[PDB]
């Protein structure tokens, strides 16, 4: 068992994500298809309760051969869902969500996780400014414009160890993650962090006790420009698209 994939059921004002978002077919069947094509004989599914505990009837219609469904609370996040199923996971966690229309062959982000011995591997596709290396595999800086009083600040040591950093603007997170065991161990030891999208910024590779294994941990990201993922920001190419 190399991975144990977890499907999240939260959001994050256009349309409701778990049940109502049916573009051409049911939305929840596609991440279970992503799992059940390339292996994943063991599936655990988190159910939504922000729709007043009604998404379990929509999640029990995919008819996968092996599923683990859990009840959850209404006000809850991704990191609290990771802390809920912590004593029943024993290996790497590969996080998905319900509203996921992914045409990307997901073996390449797993290759980025495996080949460099990464602690985290995520998938994005062209608000959030992602500073990536000149190779295009290792992201170095990420922040939003809401929590930054000054516009954006960059340490000098990451300019010394990486002289050029490629920044992107129009990227969106596809929420296809690959977590190592000590990442969720640090999530258990620090229970103040919720909404794992907001956990990607305090990753602590740079100069600072929050690491378990210069000598540091590696985090990668793959930017796609061919296989169309789900997007609802501009919605110009999302409405005039085809679903195969």
């Amino acid at each position: 068992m190399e991975f144990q994939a977890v499907v999240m059921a939260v959001g994050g004002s256009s349309i409701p994500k778990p049940l109502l978002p049916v573009g051409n077919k049911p939305l929840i069947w596609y991440p279970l298809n992503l799992l059940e094509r390339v292996g994943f004989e063991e599936v655990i599914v988190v159910t939504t309760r922000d729709v007043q505990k009604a998404l379990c009837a929509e999640f029990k219609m995919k008819m996968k051969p092996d599923i683990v469904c859990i009840p959850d609370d209404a006000d809850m996040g991704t990191a609290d869902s990771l802390r809920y199923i912590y004593p029943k996971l024993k290996t790497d966690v590969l996080v998905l969500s319900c509203d996921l229309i992914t045409d990307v062959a997901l073996h390449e982000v797993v290759d980025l996780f495996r080949a460099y011995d990464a602690s985290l591997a995520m998938l994005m596709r062209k608000r959030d400014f992602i500073g990536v290396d000149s190779t295009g595999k290792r992201l170095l800086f990420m922040a939003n414009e809401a929590d930054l009083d000054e516009e954006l600040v960059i340490k000098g040591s990451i300019l010394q160890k990486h002289p050029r950093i490629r920044f992107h603007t129009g990227l969106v997170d596809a929420h296809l993650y690959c977590l190592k065991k000590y990442i969720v161990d640090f999530l258990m030891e620090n229970g103040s962090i919720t909404s794992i999208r907001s956990e990607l910024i305090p990753y602590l590779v740079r100069k600072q006790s929050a690491s378990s294994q210069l000598k540091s941990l590696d985090i990668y990201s793959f930017i796609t420009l061919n296989l169309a993922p789900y997007d609802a920001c501009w919605n110009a190419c999302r409405g005039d698209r085809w679903e195969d």
Binding site: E2, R114, A115, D117
Partner: protein
């Protein structure tokens, strides 16, 4: 199941029997994300072999033995079956997958041979976890002594040869020769090193950084400047990847060439190789068994006029970058092992006295 990777490009007519792949595509495009047929540590090892992240001859063996420890730790015993047969039958597709990723070095071949000999000699009365602990302790003792004690012995045996005031020439990237140079500089020898590098790997920059960080005065140049500087060079250190039955030196492709030019300038060459990297296999040329690198690696950017960009459209154009060659045994003087200073003709002697005979 594990398929075969497609051969990339137009092969050399002399190298049609040897496979030539590309680092752009991977074999794990049609494999499961929870690795079931191949062990996950083994597919991690194949990914860090195929992408070129582990290039040293000792680093491949160390990462191989660590992945084998991860496989034996994640091993279970089926009913009415022996470990000493089932582990043999299961480790063979793992090494086949690793071979299809990248061709194996002879150090890794002897590691596979030693591990197969050890797991063959496991008694039937031993338990599951007890035999797992025996195999992990045997792998730990093996990598411990036959990396670091042999490295310290070869470092002392080369420290007692290098004098004061001489100049030393090196080629390629090898941790053993670099450790010899570092432990010779720290213990009191005052020398400078001429580093010879070659295209397209350019792995001389690694030992160049390792010699500048150690405080050694360094000189950096390539294959054509070696003919210019060998009248000033008095000593050549080399890093061997395999030693054969006739005394040949399998190393990087610029080794026998450099040894011939050094003998033409009367400069004695010195290879540094540990005894597990030997071979009962023998070859006399670089044509019957060799590794084929990327044909898209020979191209470079000299201005804005890259000529080998669209090399596949030319039907009469061939691209070749050899990895290994052999030396004739009359060109290489030293063979520095942990047993002492031996010539090239003593390699099957050391094979005999270390093969329980």
């Amino acid at each position: 199941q594990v398929p075969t990777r497609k051969d990339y490009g137009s092969k050399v007519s002399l190298f049609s029997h040897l496979p030539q792949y590309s680092r752009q595509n991977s074999l794990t495009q049609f494999m499961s994300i929870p690795s079931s047929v191949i062990h996950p540590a083994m597919v991690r090892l194949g990914l860090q072999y195929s992408q070129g992240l582990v290039s040293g001859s000792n680093a491949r063996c160390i990462a191989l033995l660590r992945a084998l420890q991860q496989v034996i730790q994640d091993y279970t015993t089926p009913p009415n079956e022996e470990l000493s047969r089932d582990l043999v039958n299961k480790l063979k597709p793992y090494m086949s997958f690793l071979t299809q990723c990248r061709p194996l070095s002879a150090s890794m071949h002897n590691a596979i041979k030693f591990l197969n000999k050890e797991i063959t000699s496991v008694g039937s009365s031993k338990r599951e976890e007890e035999a797992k602990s025996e195999l992990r302790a045997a792998i730990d003792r093996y990598v411990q002594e036959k990396i670091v004690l042999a490295a310290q012995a070869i470092s002392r045996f080369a420290y007692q040869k290098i004098s004061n005031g001489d100049v030393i020439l090196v080629y390629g990237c090898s941790s053993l020769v670099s450790r010899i140079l570092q432990e010779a500089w720290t213990e009191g020898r005052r020398f400078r090193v001429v580093v010879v590098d070659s295209r397209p790997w350019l792995e001389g920059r690694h030992t160049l950084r390792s010699l500048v960080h150690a405080g050694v005065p360094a000189s950096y140049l390539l294959i054509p400047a070696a003919s210019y500087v060998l009248p000033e060079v008095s000593k050549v250190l080399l890093g061997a990847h395999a030693l054969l039955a006739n005394g040949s030196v399998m190393s990087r492709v610029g080794t026998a060439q450099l040894a011939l030019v050094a003998r033409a300038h009367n400069v004695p060459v010195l290879v540094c190789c540990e005894t597990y990297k030997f071979c009962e296999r023998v070859q006399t040329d670089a044509f019957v068994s060799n590794e084929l690198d990327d044909p898209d690696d020979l191209q470079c950017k000299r201005g804005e006029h890259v000529a080998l960009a669209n090399w596949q459209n030319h039907a009469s154009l061939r691209l070749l970058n050899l990895v290994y060659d052999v030396t004739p045994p009359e060109l290489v003087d030293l063979v520095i092992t942990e047993l002492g200073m031996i010539p090239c003709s003593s390699v099957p002697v050391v094979l005999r006295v270390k093969s329980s005979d």
